[PDB]
Design a protein around this ligand. Structure first.
Ligand code: CLF
Ligand code: CLF
Ligand SMILES: [Ca+2]
Ligand SMILES: [Ca+2]
Lengths: 468, 522, 522, 467
């Protein structure tokens, strides 16, 4: 009930002091909501920083470049191989994604500056890792605070070594969340990488050239997407960022259409490429069969008769496969109610996949989404369902206590709380070390995963038989 | 494609031909990838002694570090106190990472807050963040205590935590008598273990510095135990177990074993167990204070000696046979309690195990890493087993510690081929295990990438990982284990020998080729 | 040849070229060996459905049995009593084997005697052997009791144990008040677990049969606990620990945990701990008697119910979650003690582990074997974990037991693809793991030869062995482990999930091939 | 010593009743002793049975044959893969050594008999293990007591299937130890296997043909021996029975010289082959460099100048290897005192290898040796050392407590007793899962094994620093 959910909201906010209460009330709603604002101090946010957004999300996945966590040891270590942005390569020789390169700032670096050290560590990178095809330097909190000039070093060392060196001022005090990092990361690609092959005319184009923008290949997601597009007759010139090479990014301006999956993280560079190079972009969704089919047809419509025929041939190929998945799994999950809390895309994008298994998303929310994301979410969510932006640990626990969902889909910091409460939980960031979840092949895994957890025998055993 | 009755996850899904062909096409078309021959050539070069010389000449670049940052340890220290909320003053990204890091290791909730300082606070300070942060946290999560540390942002801009907390109390944001201990924990100084020491000392100061007049050393007749940065539940558990067995009155100061092991029974317990405020206030009345991990508890030692007037015994970490005996004998002396028959027997069962397994362990060569105290304890126990700790790496170790370990190696013929490395990381260690190949690695999960590299050179060059330390992310529930005491020695003994025997079984499983040595009885 | 700095044992010594050539010439010259092509052909055939059909038609031949003989159990049972010598009336070869078998599993001394019946005793009986045997043992090894069992020789010739012992006392070879309980333990009836049952009932009878008029049920306020054939030290220890936590008075009847785990401290101890004679005399005064392993303690049940007049509760072996709950609640009912907060907490920590690990355990397929009670407990817990026990094999199982397990399977969607086999051995199981390949085997060390066979077909067909049960000969100190209670369940869970993850890591350790799925965090 | 030893002996014997005391007295001596007599009941002998001797020791190692443990389930199970008689093969297909085949006697078989069961199991073996080159049936205790005739079944089924089926009456009640099992097993080979190729002259013989008799290839011991003999110019036609095939055994009567390592277990068939085939046999010893060198020269002396020169070349080749072993290890073991208890050969045979590392054997003894073994032992042991035949568990502990040796070399039943007493122990049956110990390559392994245990750090830590 709308009235019930609204009274849930007042009640929860009664614990806060006035300052926090008035603010949080604006970030909670029933579909009217604000977002992309500062987090209230001391309320146990789930949010990361601009560094997590630039290094962890946008740049880190780029496999043939070396990414320097510039600053003290913490950030680079805690983010080391945390996100499963999958790639093919030989780690340590020509690929570098799972490694942690860092300037490991000590007090002398804080006091004197780390600019000479960065210059030296670039020489050391070049000596020990010759097959690297570029460097990025990801600023941690102290870099800007101590007045370092990482741009000059990149300019100088880059010119000296004839190598692409990318300064990213993604310090963790910047912005309010991971979201500003995306923008900074997008702008860094634009300024230092994307225009390298503007004068280059040697690339043999076709009418069906395409780029996957904002798919980070979590558990192989991007590969499960790529395969369908290329079966439809398209040529994926680039994947930004999952299993991405630098040369693919540089080739992207040559494509005919940018296929945007993650809007929040990659809409900035998508705008630029339309403005500068005229390349149109379109949002799509490859979560579940309904959205995948809808998406494949929308994409194919931007091309010609031949691609649209191939579109129908792909859809007909996979029809028996996904229908077999639903016949098996929909009866196991039908009517079950889901609550979600994730970053900037998946709180709305995975809703159709749930509905394809007969499940209802009764609550959803974002860590760092903008109003344009919430606009997009209004349409996808049901009437009278709960919305929460930058939810607090306290709120999220309280909402679940009352709503009593059958399943919760969030991150690692949420997982073990709700498991103790006796509610099945699925990690919707890391896919709980499973996936892919994209495409038709992903839906099969998704369905199997939601069922294994939601219907697991362990959940009927929380109460001791003498505790009743 | 997918067969509905046998769904393939990422592996082995992408081994399917159409995916294989797709990924070959992606590479050839758009990646501009170095030829495989060139890749092989460089890889092979990375395994050489030539590369290692360049590798060890590094002074600016750090690759695959074997350490974390200060506020990590401050949080873990803070969690060990009753209904205490760790609180990191600074930027919020840090706290997302701290919680996630421990989440993944302990597979438990990890409750910790930030006051979310932003760009505008850099120019003008985080005073308001503190006032509102402390008020919000107290009201929302209802802790009995808030333990404050700092991120590097807050340290660089130079926020006076003391004044900030005082101004918060002065202006009514939190009650004056609400306990809010603090510690400056700069991530560009030392490591995560340093933050534990700093946090603990800060809590020790908070509760006792101003109340020393009425305190008599030994009046409560207990022994204080400070565990240090500790990620095995069994280690907290074994110390308490052994002290209770001896009839030794004790006070474990910083005990997170309850919060890091709550039952899944239908409700989330944010706080559980922990060292009470009353125990910290009474601590100076103890007979003495024992530091279980003295090499990262320097500051705490100086305070305990300087203020409480406890003559902290010079004891190594209670690991392996000798140092557990020493620990128990020292405890006995201080407490006047005899070492019971139960612990005497347990020691003998450990020795019995050592004699049973000595033939498989003898001369076996190990590369290992971790924190200073953990590493020297492992090194000591390895020597006691007749093993050779060939590569001893401690990224966050110091000159004085290295001296102490070199001396331990000197006191044994099994230390003759051993070298202790401080300031080096796991990319350095990668080189060492290629050029001076050991039998096994003993370390944390980041070591799995080193085993992977060794295997790529060849199966005969593969150096298997033995997961002991922190963090362990790719195995489940190893955080329940024990490495201290006789119990811990027994667990390590068993892991080491069976790691050797599983490896032998793999190498001798070839039908008609090597299975002549595939013994049923070993 | 050898390099003195790097001595080679058999493996890899005989992989040297000169040995490889020598062995090739031996084969070619003198072995008259079948061509390798023919060997490969026959091997592939032995992996088929057709061979399996033949395999399962066997009536007379047994191959690689999953059981031992009665007197083995009788010895283990007798070893559990205070200062008692197990004594096997019959031929001596048996005792040499019993001792060695247990020596190899526990890596401890195993004391046991024979009366060395020879050729001539077949004609005229083993009477004099008993007389001199008892007197010699009594004098030489100085036990407080001698527990007599039999070898098949003695059973076939029909030596009356009762009379032979009575006469030994009549003639003055041993004092008439010296305890000499006996049991007929024919190797050609049942299995080793039956000898345990027979021996225990015999000892029960000895101290109680002709003393019942004195007894009153419940007068000592204790609960008798009969462990059965039990080769994990931690199982004895977990049951006592749990009952002590509840504040329940108990008598563990047959407790070998001290003798099978003496300290190495400069002296050998033949006897240690154990169930006292007087515990056995006073057993009828218990409230009730709980059989931990009821499916091989039938005879004992009949005696405790028939003579002691105890209402032995219908309880399954306390393995896994449900049966540990039922065990504890039954113990609470009988004793009138509530289940304490500590056990409730520990239960929830097991459940918490189950929730953290369920995604790797879900749908995993297991072939397993062992003794009746152990297999069903394992089967139960596997189902509680969402695992599928596809091949369930108990060589020494019976029809009534199979019905029980089939019903357990039927009450779960995870038992849908399960089949229970009784009277079948590990050579049958070998076929099953080829034709209906599981992901893992759970079993004893003999299972390593099945994994070796599967790998030879191909790595994709290899079925790794998880070592749980008896005997474990090729790993060290796993006899210290636990399989009962919440503790045992937590140990099984951890072993199972890490076995899965270890195999996943192996399969994904291929550089640039399968290492895309080589996750740091799992 | 001396003298102290006889005082030790009488003190230890005083715990026994008089019957046992009078008997055990005869089996203890100072280097005069009887042996191969029945065991006194209840004294915890370390001895096994005739089945152990026939199946476990002689027949079991034969790799291309299937050996049936005929009787109940125990004997076959406890003896499965217990002894490390190494072989090369594809187990379950053409080799079967580590497997347990059994008739798994139930009570119906005890009452009715097992002969119809044996016949059915032979058929089942043929169907499921086609590549087997022969079958043996190893009788367990009940087979003879029950009145079964495995001979008739073997003759009939063997003739039906054109297969070699060997009936062995090695029931455990027979004899007094493993020893009679050897004898029974030797006669089994003689009657049912060894004479098959009497008529067959197709095998092309050379003057340098030889057979290694009584090497069971424990941890590769036989392979370590064969390599030296063949380097010396000889052709080892057969290995009895470590890594042994049935054809190798059938070829043996074509050889020129039988090289006997284990006298106790194989002297019977060796004497037979001298009688029937005129093949001379000689004992040798390949434990340590001194004995191996001695043996190589004794063996080479039976042939011609060309083999004798190749002998000196083999000796010259390995000289720097074994000399490097002693240089490294003798100083670590010099002066250390060893006590031994093993079966029928190694209590005397390994003494030379110990002495090559400067170690003293202060006591030794056999489980099941005959007087002719003790005759051979007398020489190898020093004056006033302790001899014990069929030693009791009690005696052995007491002797060690008084004598206080630096190292004990015995079996698995002894191992964990003496480790708890704080005395270094090495398994001298199984080689503690190490080895080989035979030959020059074996000595290196032997030496590093004795050193690693005797000088292990764990032995300093038996007593707690607070008692
Ligand atoms: S919000 Fe972010 S993750 Fe934090 S520093 Fe900061 S850029 Fe980084 Fe780094 S080492 Fe730590 S976690 Fe920091 S306090 Fe520094
Ligand atoms: S002295 Fe020997 S090992 Fe013993 S039977 Fe006997 S032949 Fe054998 Fe067999 S099954 Fe057991 S151990 Fe026997 S009582 Fe029978
Ligand atoms: Ca947990
Ligand atoms: Ca032991």
């Amino acid at each position: 009930s709308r009235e019930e959910v609204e009274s849930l909201i007042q009640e929860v906010l009664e614990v806060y002091p006035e300052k926090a209460r008035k603010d949080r009330n604006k970030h909670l709603a029933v579909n009217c909501i604000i977002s992309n604002k500062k987090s209230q101090p001391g309320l146990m946010t789930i949010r990361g920083c601009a560094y997590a957004g630039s290094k962890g999300i946008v740049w880190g996945p780029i496999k043939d470049m070396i990414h320097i966590s510039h600053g003290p040891v913490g950030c680079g270590q805690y983010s080391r191989a945390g996100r499963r942005n999958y790639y093919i390569g030989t780690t340590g020789v020509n690929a570098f994604v799972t490694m942690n390169f860092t300037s490991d700032f000590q007090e002398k670096d804080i006091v004197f500056g780390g600019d000479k050290k960065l210059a030296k560590l670039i020489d050391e990178v070049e000596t020990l890792f010759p097959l690297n095809k570029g460097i990025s330097v990801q600023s941690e909190c102290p870099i800007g605070l101590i007045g370092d000039d990482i741009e000059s070093v990149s300019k100088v060392k880059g010119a000296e070594l004839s190598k692409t060196i990318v300064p990213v001022r993604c310090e963790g005090f910047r912005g309010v969340s991971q979201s500003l990092g995306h923008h900074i990361a997008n702008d860094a690609v634009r300024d230092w990488v994307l225009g390298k092959r503007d004068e280059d005319t040697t690339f043999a184009s076709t009418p069906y050239d395409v780029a996957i923008i904002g798919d980070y290949n979590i558990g192989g997601d991007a590969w499960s997407s790529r395969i369908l597009l290329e079966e439809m007759g398209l040529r994926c010139v680039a994947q930004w960022s999952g299993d991405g090479s630098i040369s693919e990014i540089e080739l992207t301006p040559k494509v005919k259409l940018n296929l945007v999956h993650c809007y929040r993280s990659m809409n900035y560079i998508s705008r630029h490429m339309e403005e500068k190079y005229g390349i149109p972009w379109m949002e799509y969704n490859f979560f579940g069969p309904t959205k995948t089919i809808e998406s494949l047809r929308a994409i194919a419509a931007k091309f010609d008769e031949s691609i649209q025929k191939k579109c129908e041939e792909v859809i007909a190929k996979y029809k028996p496969e996904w229908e077999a998945v639903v016949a098996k799994y929909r009866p196991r999950l039908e009517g079950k109610r889901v609550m979600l809390y994730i970053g900037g895309l998946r709180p709305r994008h995975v809703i159709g996949a749930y509905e394809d298994l007969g499940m209802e998303v009764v609550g959803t929310g974002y860590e760092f989404a903008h109003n344009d994301d919430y606009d997009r979410t209004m349409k996808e969510m049901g009437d009278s369902t709960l919305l929460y932006d930058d939810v607090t640990g306290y709120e999220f626990e309280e909402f679940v206590k009352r709503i009593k969902p059958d399943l919760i889909g969030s991150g690692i910091k949420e997982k073990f709380i709700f498991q103790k409460m006796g509610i099945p939980f699925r990690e919707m960031h890391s896919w709980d070390y499973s996936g892919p979840y994209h495409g038709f092949d992903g839906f099969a895994i998704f369905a199997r995963d939601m069922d294994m957890t939601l219907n697991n025998p362990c959940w009927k055993k929380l109460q001791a038989p003498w505790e009743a | 494609s997918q067969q509905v009755d046998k769904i393939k996850a990422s592996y082995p899904l992408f081994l399917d031909q159409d995916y294989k062909d797709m990924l070959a096409k992606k590479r050839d078309g758009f990646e501009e990838k170095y030829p495989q021959d060139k890749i092989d050539e460089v890889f092979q070069w990375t395994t050489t002694k030539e590369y290692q010389e360049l590798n060890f000449q590094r002074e600016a670049l750090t690759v695959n570090p074997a350490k974390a940052c200060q506020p990590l340890g401050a949080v873990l220290c803070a969690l060990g106190f009753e209904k205490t909320m760790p609180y990191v003053h600074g930027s919020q990204g840090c706290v997302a990472y701290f919680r996630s890091y421990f989440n993944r290791h302990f597979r438990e909730p990890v409750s910790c807050v930030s006051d979310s300082m932003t760009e505008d606070a850099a120019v003008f300070g985080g005073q308001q963040n503190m006032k509102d942060g402390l008020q919000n946290c107290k009201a929302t999560y209802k802790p009995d205590m808030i333990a404050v540390s700092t991120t590097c942002m807050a340290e660089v801009i130079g926020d006076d935590l003391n004044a900030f907390i005082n101004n918060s109390k002065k202006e009514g944001f939190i009650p004056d008598e609400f306990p809010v201990p603090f510690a400056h924990t700069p991530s560009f100084v030392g490591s995560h273990v340093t933050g534990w020491d700093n946090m603990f000392e800060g809590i020790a100061r908070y509760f006792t510095l101003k109340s020393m007049d009425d305190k008599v050393v030994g009046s409560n007749k207990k022994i204080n135990i400070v565990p240090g940065f500790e990620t095995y539940l069994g280690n907290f558990r074994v110390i308490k177990r052994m002290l209770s067995e001896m009839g030794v009155g004790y006070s474990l100061l910083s005990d997170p074993e309850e919060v890091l092991d709550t039952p899944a029974d239908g409700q989330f317990r944010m706080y559980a167990g922990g060292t009470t405020q009353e125990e910290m206030k009474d601590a100076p009345n103890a007979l003495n204070t024992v530091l279980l991990q003295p090499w990262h508890l320097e500051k705490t030692k100086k305070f305990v000696e300087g203020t409480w007037k406890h003559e902290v015994p010079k004891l190594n970490i209670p690991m392996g046979l000798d140092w557990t005996d020493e620990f128990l004998m020292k405890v006995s002396e201080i407490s006047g309690q005899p070492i019971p028959a139960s612990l005497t027997k347990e020691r003998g069962r450990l020795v019995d195990m050592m004699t049973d397994s000595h033939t498989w362990l003898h001369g076996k060569r190990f590369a290992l890493w971790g924190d200073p105290d953990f590493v020297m304890g492992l090194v000591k126990f390895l020597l006691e087993l007749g093993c050779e700790p060939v590569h001893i790496l401690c990224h966050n170790g110091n000159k004085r510690w290295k001296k102490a370990v070199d001396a331990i190696l000197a006191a044994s013929p099994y230390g003759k081929n051993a070298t202790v490395y401080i300031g080096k990381d796991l990319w350095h260690l990668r080189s060492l295990v290629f050029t001076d190949k050991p039998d096994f690695m003993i370390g944390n999960s980041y070591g799995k990438f080193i085993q992977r590299d060794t295997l790529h050179k060849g199966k005969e060059f593969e150096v298997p990982l033995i997961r002991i330390g922190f963090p362990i992310f790719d195995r489940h529930h190893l955080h329940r284990s024990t490495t201290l005491g006789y119990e811990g020695a027994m667990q390590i003994l068993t892991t080491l020998v069976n790691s050797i025997l599983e490896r032998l079984d793999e190498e001798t499983r070839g039908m008609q080729a090597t299975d002549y040595n595939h013994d049923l009885v070993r």
